[PDB]
Ligand binder design. Structure first.
Ligand SMILES: C=CCO[C@H]1O[C@H](CO)[C@@H](OC)[C@H](O)[C@@H]1O
Ligand SMILES: C=CCO[C@H]1O[C@H](CO)[C@@H](OC)[C@H](O)[C@@H]1O
Ligand SMILES: C=CCO[C@H]1O[C@H](CO)[C@@H](OC)[C@H](O)[C@@H]1O
Ligand SMILES: C=CCO[C@H]1O[C@H](CO)[C@@H](OC)[C@H](O)[C@@H]1O
Ligand SMILES: C=CCO[C@H]1O[C@H](CO)[C@@H](OC)[C@H](O)[C@@H]1O
Ligand SMILES: C=CCO[C@H]1O[C@H](CO)[C@@H](OC)[C@H](O)[C@@H]1O
Ligand SMILES: C=CCO[C@H]1O[C@H](CO)[C@@H](OC)[C@H](O)[C@@H]1O
Ligand SMILES: C=CCO[C@H]1O[C@H](CO)[C@@H](OC)[C@H](O)[C@@H]1O
Ligand SMILES: C=CCO[C@H]1O[C@H](CO)[C@@H](OC)[C@H](O)[C@@H]1O
Ligand SMILES: C=CCO[C@H]1O[C@H](CO)[C@@H](OC)[C@H](O)[C@@H]1O
Ligand SMILES: C=CCO[C@H]1O[C@H](CO)[C@@H](OC)[C@H](O)[C@@H]1O
Ligand SMILES: C=CCO[C@H]1O[C@H](CO)[C@@H](OC)[C@H](O)[C@@H]1O
Ligand SMILES: C=CCO[C@H]1O[C@H](CO)[C@@H](OC)[C@H](O)[C@@H]1O
Ligand SMILES: C=CCO[C@H]1O[C@H](CO)[C@@H](OC)[C@H](O)[C@@H]1O
Ligand SMILES: C=CCO[C@H]1O[C@H](CO)[C@@H](OC)[C@H](O)[C@@H]1O
Ligand SMILES: [Mg+2]
Ligand SMILES: [Mg+2]
Ligand SMILES: [Mg+2]
Ligand SMILES: [Mg+2]
Lengths: 226, 226, 226, 222
């Protein structure tokens, strides 16, 4: 079930139990501390979406579409040229975004030439440490990336409808639909989703299995198995 | 202690908290969902043993000795030539089996030429993500693989008796004996086993520390530390 | 909060949930079993500090300054030439120590020529699986290693005062001050520490998020998030 | 077998599915985009060998022997001279120089290399600490200098290029261009894999990429 955690957030991303970040409605940025008694520390800056990876990589975008990577020093963030609306970092080497037109981009590893457009149209995306990438489009159709596995069409459609998706590793894929219903991937593409009790508007599914979410009213939860 | 989980299984393998599979007595295949309220989803096919790795690799064998690897798409399984009785996958690159004659094989990474025989005789085997491999023979003697570390005899005998063994990583080795008594490796080859309260016929020890087991009556348990 | 664990230890190191070692005041060596009902097994030998990594690497030093690496066989330990007072192993490839004069050394991977001196003076050090290295000096000043990232001064000073530090991965850094007060890194170098309720003299912060500590009276604790 | 990926390269390294780099004959540097349809982006600079790690680490050497580490913001020169280089991770970086002496990165940019006893012409360094090498003559060695062997153990066979992503993912080519992968059995160490290649890069996650004499690029399809 979900454990309620104090605080208020609008979006959230979890790469591992030790690297969990979110933004609130005012665009303040927070990082989870590891202590549920005082779970959040505000990190300076302003973001509207964030992607945090198991390896410590953190990327964000702001209201204007400006893109940032955390540099783990007193400068805090560095702006990376281009414009994005949503972003997910599975690792240093697997960072993806969606711009305001729905175009899909992948970080090239070159800050001087940082993005290559990957064919397709999405509204949210979730990238993993192992190369896993899932997305959803504005109508809720769900896709898994195949463009690095020889598929000239780049994406395979997986049945169902979701509005937010996260995939920190191949085996930890979660999403929510437009009515806030929570789902997790079964690993069977022909019976792909299990409904999970609860209600969320965004979700972050980590490489080590950690799952965090936020609901419509800004309430924050972590998934508890044991 | 052990947390009882609903369902009924005959064998089980855990590569990580997010990749846990089992088979029941009817040879139905199940994958753990991450929700203990509804812990299992049946995956189509029929298997008598399964090996699931932290990296998502899943291998199985059926009653006839047919060998399969999960392809994480709508085809579900692909049959790999050869015949095995027991199988363990520590990773994509560390997959081992034992055939009905007790001969030991290692997956070569070439589906057209998939197995090389490794000297020795075993009845169960457990392979890890870091290359770790342990086995037991029909009389219960316990061995750890040394054939990739210069040892011309391939295996070092470790004192004790076990009938099932699992080793998802060097530091997470568990087994059961023929009387269903549970043991975990101490890491001291001269005092190698600690008895653990409980009773199990098969056990799966994951790379991230997760431990699952099944008992003689098909009852399922996950190890809880906290 | 902290879960009390039975036993008595003077120092402790945790690389992952499955690789946690400590030494007691008599210099006996123990490894955590994974069962809190019987949490420790004594490993033969005598050490005054130990460093245990996620990948299974374990290094120690004894009262005389002798340095040892665990060989995961019936020989138990191998002595490595040189003299150290404190040691930390983040991985097989990231092992650091501090000698009795405060000089800082890094394991070269060559047992015949095992140490290179890294400029600076420390009293405790903590190394990670991802290359992360933090240290503190005798006055409590805190430093993070930058000498493999182009910095000719080798260390960046981070505000605060600590007497023991551990850093199993970039995102899991913990320390204690000389008054036994516990702190964890926020990831903001300008607001770097969060106070954690409790009292400890040594702490081990694992690559997978596990955190163990020992207090002044030898009492042992594991950090619990859920 | 192998899937042909468009382009042409002379040397290649894969640390993981998502970190694959190569250089072409002209010494132009390329990184795999993750899009098989538009598979390469050129990275500024000139190199003759490159090593890419699972954690994103990238090191290279130029024709002259200058050594560079990629900075992910393009290249910083690190003091010394090397002819080949491999990086399994930030903390496991090895190379050989033109005369065949073997070096490992110290983790100290101001004092960056320590020489390791022996003679090699290619080397593969893994994320888990695994190091394999081949000598001019084609003899194959695995490193044991960090586990009590006063350094290298010879494994039978002959190879001209070698790559190790992990203890369990080791590949090489012989001078005839035959491809081999390590079996995990020192007494029967090699399995021949169908095809012909001149360089190969093997990742920790099982990823394997290669280039043939003519510059054709291939990814192994398990
Ligand atoms: C702002 C610079 C150019 O913009 C276009 O190309 C860039 C990529 O070069 C996009 O940024 C990711 C942006 O969203 C848009 O599609
Ligand atoms: C008609 C096909 C092209 O676009 C469609 O398919 C592509 C994928 O092929 C989607 O991009 C992810 C897009 O959202 C849409 O559903
Ligand atoms: C029309 C059938 C599917 O709709 C429902 O069930 C499916 C799951 O089977 C959801 O897809 C993820 C969808 O969002 C919705 O809740
Ligand atoms: C079924 C094909 C040939 O069988 C023999 O060799 C193969 C290996 O080539 C074995 O399969 C693993 C099988 O068990 C047996 O020993
Ligand atoms: C007499 C030695 C050969 O076989 C024995 O030793 C080998 C190992 O050397 C065992 O194989 C794992 C086998 O089960 C048996 O115990
Ligand atoms: C005869 C002494 C050993 O037997 C018992 O204890 C040992 C453990 O010390 C078990 O070995 C794993 C064995 O299965 C049995 O339960
Ligand atoms: C004991 C051998 C030589 O000692 C000196 O150099 C060695 C390093 O070569 C140090 O051991 C780490 C020791 O502490 C001292 O500084
Ligand atoms: C005056 C500077 C040299 O030493 C100081 O700085 C160095 C770091 O530059 C410290 O070493 C870690 C040392 O402890 C001390 O604080
Ligand atoms: C003088 C101000 C700082 O001192 C206190 O707070 C700081 C934390 O802000 C501690 O630094 C880690 C220090 O040890 C002490 O407890
Ligand atoms: C057909 C295009 C010419 O190939 C050029 O660009 C390609 C990349 O588009 C290079 O392949 C890696 C090739 O080496 C050369 O520089
Ligand atoms: C001086 C700039 C152009 O090339 C030089 O520097 C670049 C790096 O800036 C090297 O490429 C990696 C190249 O080999 C050469 O040494
Ligand atoms: C200037 C020093 C001479 O360089 C020697 O040692 C250096 C390292 O100190 C080597 O670079 C790796 C170089 O190849 C050569 O053997
Ligand atoms: C005493 C032997 C010196 O060199 C031989 O053995 C060494 C290894 O001991 C090789 O270096 C890796 C070298 O290439 C050669 O085969
Ligand atoms: C003695 C056998 C001849 O060696 C052949 O096969 C071996 C492997 O058995 C190759 O070594 C990797 C070698 O290059 C050659 O092709
Ligand atoms: C056409 C089959 C034989 O070789 C061709 O294709 C193979 C791959 O199918 C290449 O080996 C990797 C080889 O270099 C060549 O390009
Ligand atoms: Mg997101
Ligand atoms: Mg099994
Ligand atoms: Mg310590
Ligand atoms: Mg190479």
């Amino acid at each position: 079930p979900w454990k309620g955690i104090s605080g208020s957030l609008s979006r959230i991303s979890a790469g591992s139990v030790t690297n969990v970040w979110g933004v609130n409605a005012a665009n303040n940025i927070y990082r989870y501390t590891g202590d549920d008694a005082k779970p959040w520390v505000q990190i300076p800056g302003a973001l509207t979406d964030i992607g945090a990876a198991a390896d410590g990589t953190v990327w964000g975008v702001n209201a204007a579409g400006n893109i940032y990577r955390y540099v783990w020093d007193s400068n805090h963030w560095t702006q990376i040229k281009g414009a994005l609306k949503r972003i997910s970092a599975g690792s240093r080497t697997n960072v993806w975004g969606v711009n305001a037109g729905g175009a899909i981009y992948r970080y090239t590893g070159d800050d001087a030439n940082p993005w290559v457009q990957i064919p397709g149209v999405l509204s949210d995306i979730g990238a993993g440490a192992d190369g896993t990438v899932w997305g959803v489009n504005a109508a809720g159709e769900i896709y898994r990336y195949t463009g690095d596995q020889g598929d000239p069409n780049h994406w395979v459609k997986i049945p169902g409808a979701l509005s937010a998706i996260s995939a920190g590793i191949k085996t930890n894929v979660w999403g929510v639909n437009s009515a806030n219903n929570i789902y997790t991937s079964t690993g069977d593409d022909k019976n792909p989703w299990l409904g999970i009790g609860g209600s969320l508007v965004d979700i972050g599914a980590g490489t080590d299995g950690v799952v965090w979410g936020v609901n419509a009213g800004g309430g924050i939860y972590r998934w508890i198995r044991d």
